[PDB]
Amino acid sequence: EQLTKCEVFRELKDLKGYGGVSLPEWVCTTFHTSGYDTQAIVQNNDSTEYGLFQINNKIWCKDDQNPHSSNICNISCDKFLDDDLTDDIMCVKKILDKVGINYWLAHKALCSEKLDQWLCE
Template identity: 80%
Template sequence: SGCDTQTVVNNNGSTEYGLFQINNKIWCRDNHIPHSRDICGISCDKFLDDDLTDDIMCVKKILDNV
């Protein structure tokens, strides 16, 4: 992500959020993908702030699921 904590919209309509580019189709929920799996159980907007605690917790879940 180039140390950018913003969003990147993909060609498939999904969005990557925050420093770790966490995808809204599987890992978090937002208004763009109403049927997200939301495995991390968190709003994607939480990955856009300077607090990386929740980002890191979600990344741990991602690593446990791959």
Template identity: 70%
Template sequence: MMSFVSLLLVGIMFPAIQAKQFRKCELSQVLKDMDGFGGIALPEWICTVFHTSGYDTQTIVSNNGSTEYGLFQINNKFWCRDNQILQSRNICDISCDKFLDDDLTDDMICAKKILDKEGIDCC
């Protein structure tokens, strides 16, 4: 009983990351401010997100020695920092795990930086 109480207290003190599996129409509403950014229409953003993460904020993919995080699959080698690549360039100045929650504000800011610097492959 005592270990259950301890576990319950730990669960309350350290809530799980609030991840989200978006639906297409719901995601369209959240990403509406991305429409037209860099000449990319909202349907192209939605298509790109579907093909990179399946609309799931907790998507993590290992790719040639680096890892990509979240809806936009933002890479830890250049754009964010994690414990895997300690010398990341971290251009977006953010921890990679921030791309795994349901708040897409920081994801969109970083995606715009990536588009400004590198462009994006759309559908």
């Protein structure tokens, strides 16, 4: 699913404020992470990143490329490619708990200013 900006804003409600990250910050960060494509996959021969949040199969979820992933989120990476972001968000919270927002390199570069582009009524 190719989400719109304010569909992301709505669907990410449960991340608002968690770990100090605002919802406009998440709307910006996801745009510059996956372009709002819930089916985005970025890969090389070592690792694969999945979905709206580009969660990786090195340590966060398990897949066929890396079946021995630590799988901290205790989930198949395939669950990050569907339209339901509930499990996505649960995993994002674990990422924030352990390594914080700089898992998403777009946040510092692109989403620490001009947050008024990322607002929804």
